[PDB]
Amino acid sequence: WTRGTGLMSANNIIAEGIEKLGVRTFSQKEMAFNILGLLTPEIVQLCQE
Amino acid sequence: AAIPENGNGLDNIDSKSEFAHRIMLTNLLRLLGAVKSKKTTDTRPAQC
Amino acid sequence: NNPNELTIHFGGAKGRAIRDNYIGMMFETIGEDGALKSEKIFKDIDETTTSYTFVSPTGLLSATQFTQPALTLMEKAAYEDIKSK
C-alpha cells in the first residue's frame, strides 16, 4: 500500500483504518527506500543465482 | 510505467485497457527482450 | 578495433570465476633494503570489485600487456600458416 497523490487520494482516508489491524502502509519515500534496498551488493549477487 | 485505468470491468475491457496491457506487459517484455540482444557479455547481468 | 580503454566486468557466476584469476596473479618484488615487502598492489581488484578498467591514452594495442599477446598470436598465425604449406 503506497500512500501517494494522484488518483489514490480517495484511498488515503482509510490507510489509518487498516493500519489499526497491525498492518502498515507506505509513503513514496518509504517504497523508495524499500526498492533501492534491492540494489545492495549482497542482493545483487543473490539475484544472479 | 503504467496507465491509470479505472472503471473498466470485464464487460468493458476497452481500448484504453488494450493499450495499457501493451504498455505494462506485451511491450515490457520486448523492453527486457531488447536489452538482451544488445548484450554480448555474459559477465554483466541486468537486474530487472 | 583498437580502443583507448577497456572495462573488464566481473558479472555473474562465470564473472566471479574471472576476477579470481586476477586476484591470484600476484608478483613479488623484494626491495633493495633486504626487507621482504610482502604487500598488496591490487587493491583495485578484491572480493567486492565488480569492474576493473584498463586505461592507456595511446591505445590498448600499444599498451604493454596487450601488445605482446597480439604479436605472438600473429607470429604463430603466420608460422602455422607457413608450416601448413
Swiss-Prot record, chain A:
It comes from the Eukaryota. [Alpha(6)beta(6)] hexamers of two multifunctional subunits (alpha and beta). Fatty acid synthetase catalyzes the formation of long-chain fatty acids from acetyl-CoA, malonyl-CoA and NADPH. The alpha subunit contains domains for: acyl carrier protein, 3-oxoacyl-[acyl-carrier-protein] reductase, and 3-oxoacyl-[acyl-carrier-protein] synthase. Belongs to the thiolase-like superfamily. Fungal fatty acid synthetase subunit alpha family. This is Fatty acid synthase subunit alpha. It comes from Candida albicans.
UniProtKB/Swiss-Prot annotation, chain C:
Signal peptide: none annotated. Transmembrane segments: none annotated. Belongs to the fungal fatty acid synthetase subunit beta family. Fatty acid synthetase catalyzes the formation of long-chain fatty acids from acetyl-CoA, malonyl-CoA and NADPH. The beta subunit contains domains for: [acyl-carrier-protein] acetyltransferase and malonyltransferase, S-acyl fatty acid synthase thioesterase, enoyl-[acyl-carrier-protein] reductase, and 3-hydroxypalmitoyl-[acyl-carrier-protein] dehydratase. [Alpha(6)beta(6)] hexamers of two multifunctional subunits (alpha and beta). This is Fatty acid synthase subunit beta. The chain holds residues 1699 to 1783 of 2037 of the full protein.
